[PDB]
Amino acid sequence: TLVKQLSSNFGAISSVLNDILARLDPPEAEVQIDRLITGRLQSLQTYVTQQLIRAAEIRASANLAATKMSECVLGQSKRVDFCGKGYHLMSFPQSAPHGVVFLHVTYVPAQEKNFTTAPAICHDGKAHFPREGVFVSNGTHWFVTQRNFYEPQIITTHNTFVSGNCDVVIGIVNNTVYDPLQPELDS
Amino acid sequence: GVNCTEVPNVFQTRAGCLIGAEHVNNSYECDIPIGAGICASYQTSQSIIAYTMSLGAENSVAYSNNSIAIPINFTISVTTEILPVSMTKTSVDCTMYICGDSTECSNLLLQYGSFCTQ
Amino acid sequence: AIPINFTISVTTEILPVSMTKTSVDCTMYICGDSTECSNLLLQYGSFCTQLNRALTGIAVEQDKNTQEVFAQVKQIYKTPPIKDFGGFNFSQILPDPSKPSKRSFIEDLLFNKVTFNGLTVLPPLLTDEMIAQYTSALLAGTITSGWTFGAGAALQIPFAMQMAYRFNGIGVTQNVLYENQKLIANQFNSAIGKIQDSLSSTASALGKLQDVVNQNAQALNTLVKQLSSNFGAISSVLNDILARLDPPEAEVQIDRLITGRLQSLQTYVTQQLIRAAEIRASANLAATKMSECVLGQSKRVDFCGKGYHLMSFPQSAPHGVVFLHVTYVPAQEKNFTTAPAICHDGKAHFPREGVFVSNGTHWFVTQRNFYEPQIITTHNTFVSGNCDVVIGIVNNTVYDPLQPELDS
Ligand SMILES: *[C@@H]1O[C@H](CO)[C@@H](O[C@@H]2O[C@H](CO)[C@@H](O)[C@H](O)[C@H]2NC(C)=O)[C@H](O)[C@H]1NC(C)=O
Ligand SMILES: *[C@@H]1O[C@H](CO)[C@@H](O[C@@H]2O[C@H](CO)[C@@H](O)[C@H](O)[C@H]2NC(C)=O)[C@H](O)[C@H]1NC(C)=O
Ligand SMILES: *[C@@H]1O[C@H](CO)[C@@H](O[C@@H]2O[C@H](CO)[C@@H](O)[C@H](O)[C@H]2NC(C)=O)[C@H](O)[C@H]1NC(C)=O
Ligand SMILES: *[C@@H]1O[C@H](CO)[C@@H](O[C@@H]2O[C@H](CO)[C@@H](O)[C@H](O)[C@H]2NC(C)=O)[C@H](O)[C@H]1NC(C)=O
Ligand SMILES: *[C@@H]1O[C@H](CO)[C@@H](O)[C@H](O)[C@H]1NC(C)=O
Ligand SMILES: *[C@@H]1O[C@H](CO)[C@@H](O)[C@H](O)[C@H]1NC(C)=O
Ligand SMILES: *[C@@H]1O[C@H](CO)[C@@H](O)[C@H](O)[C@H]1NC(C)=O
């Protein structure tokens, strides 16, 4: 568009400047050249202004790209949905023509399956909560998995702790909590 | 944006008049956007069809007070993201663009202050 | 100093997301229904289709924004019939069957607060019902599924456990919740109502998205009010010049008017172009404040509201979006003497995750943000070395659980 604006007329009798200077010597060449100069100058100013605004856009995007390359690549961002959709593992940058491209590796849980649960467990009066994990039941027995992977294992005292008495927790469930120390006592 | 009784099947949208597009009654993830929830697309003997866009398949999560779902499997998914970082470094000279080897124009341009240096 | 009690607070944040679309014809504005302004305007070059190309770019991005903000979910979840969520009732942010346009008791008092010359006003791509349905899907997917409807499919989890496993992020344990469920529930209910009161009483908060419609109507007013200005010519009414001066005097007069009107229109387009950059800057902040605060649990400080952020709910608003950050601000304090390490039988028992504190005679090992003092055992402390290098070491006794068991 900036180039094409040169062929325009703007009110003079011609657009090509030499021909104007090749037909009209003393003042009237100048009265036409005034119009030519005004028009061309305004077109140039407009072009410069949108260039400035577009450059601001690009710089905002480039700062975003710099942040992504600093956080996704070198470390391991916990900011959800920042570096990909799911749980972030790694990333591998790739060049691109006037840009950069990332390759977000991501863990994605699937193949769900539902169990009845329980916030805690009474046993001999004291309500046991899980250290890390959740309580579940496979229909008849109660286990303690982790969050994102059904890897059940026997409830014990090395993975559950004690707080108070099961009178205020709402939704308590009876069970027995296994002590590894008891079997190894007859020596 | 014209009540299209006043124009030279024929659908009457909230954003104007859409002539030459069938108003189907089902809903899809839309291809070509128009406005006010109306999109158009090419599908099935073929023709063009306009409708109201959809947002997604319904899902009623069976929420109970003592039930939790725990995944049994994972699946590593690798995706892509593209971002611009720079644009070409273009520079323009004022005097060549405005006058162009035409000193009798540069003398006049002199009077206009300093609309080259900035 | 270690807190004894806590308070739950439900603040508010308001951001603008998108302007109102517009599109201005060139020659209907410059030359209002005239033909003697065809010759006198084809002279100037590609001005018209520059102005008619910047405006559509703005118009399309102003609608890309509202689709990048609210359309981060993939499916439309719905709650079960009424409610069961422990003691928390979201009975006044959730949609209701009444009021045909599905909309909740808060984003209704938000909509009841901000109540042609060559100018056209195009409609938005997403009507006010579709945004309200997105903000209800994102609301029914977090009340029922927690962290994990942004990762993949939505996994159910009872709400009590959701709120309990959200504390374990900010630092406090889960017993702290389960023995204080009633307190936290009735603190949360009697903190949502203050938002209703504050929003209904005055328009104090919704200024951020009101001084935007109050600024896009100043430029749009000046643009049409500068049609009545001679700009340095005999008249401003086009037909009057067209009639009074037939010879090539109308050329110079109409050139003066055309230059004036073209300059005014160009300086309107430039102002819109600049003003549409900060709107996108705020729309890009809404997207990353709604990915992180809503669909997760941010550990950044002061980002999702002051305090320890643990939940949040989105609520729509006219050309905007409103959050309802929930935080965990501790309360009434005490003061205790402390020690960097105990010293039992030559070694130095550091605390696993906590702080040793005292009362004058006893010692304990508590958390950070609550005061539940256990008893120092070799299940709360890990031994490292000897008892001289540490500065501030104290000497005490450290209980061992297996010892009072061998006797029987
Ligand atoms: C899941 O529940 C099933 C019952 O439906 C358990 O099956 C029995 O578990 C007992 C444990 O004391 C075993 O002695 C039995 O041999 C099991 N049954 C069979 C047919 O082998 C099962 O153990 C539970 N899951 C786990 C991991 O224990
Ligand atoms: C879990 O088991 C305990 C003990 O087996 C039950 O405690 C009962 O409590 C009531 C009132 O405190 C007593 O009258 C009973 O004698 C206790 N024992 C039994 C076997 O009932 C407790 O009720 C059980 N949990 C539930 C939900 O019933
Ligand atoms: C979880 O939901 C079930 C719904 O079945 C609740 O079960 C109800 O319990 C009350 C009182 O115990 C009974 O009067 C109802 O008859 C039960 N429902 C049915 C369909 O029989 C259960 O109470 C809920 N969990 C908690 C902790 O209240
Ligand atoms: C988790 O998903 C993978 C698929 O990615 C399952 O792998 C399949 O396992 C079955 C059973 O051994 C094989 O017959 C298939 O050939 C495997 N397919 C692939 C593509 O690996 C894996 O078994 C799943 N895990 C569980 C516990 O079911
Ligand atoms: C798991 O969910 C399905 C429906 O989503 C339900 O029919 C089934 O009974 C649930 N399983 C258990 C053990 O509750
Ligand atoms: C268009 O004009 C007719 C004439 O009365 C009217 O009946 C119709 O409702 C108008 N269209 C719309 C969309 O209002
Ligand atoms: C869709 O079908 C229903 C059923 O008759 C009708 O009421 C409605 O007007 C139809 N909509 C369109 C766009 O054809």
Author numbering:
A (entry chain A): 961 to 1147
B (entry chain A): 614 to 621, 641 to 676, 689 to 762
C (entry chain B): 713 to 827, 855 to 1147
Pull verbatim passages from the article behind this deposition:
They are scattered in different locations throughout the trimeric structure in the prefusion state. For the A570 in the C-terminal domain (CTD) of the S1 subunit, the D570 substitution generates a new hydrogen bond to K964 in the S2 subunit of the other protomer, improving the overall stability of the S-trimer. Similarly, the T716I and S982A substitutions abrogate the original interactions of T716 and S982, respectively, with the related residues, suggesting local destabilizing effects for increasing the propensity for the “up” RBD conformation. Finally, the D1118H substitution forms a symmetric histidine triad that may help stabilize the S-trimer through water-mediated interactions.
The rapid spread of B.1.1.7 has increased concern about those natural mutations in the S protein, including 69–70 deletion, 144 deletion, N501Y, A570D, D614G, P681H, T716I, S982A, and D1118H. To improve protein stability for cryo-EM data processing, proline substitutions at K986 and V987 and a “GSAS” substitution at the furin cleavage site (S1/S2 site, R682 to R685) were introduced into the purified S protein, according to a previous report.
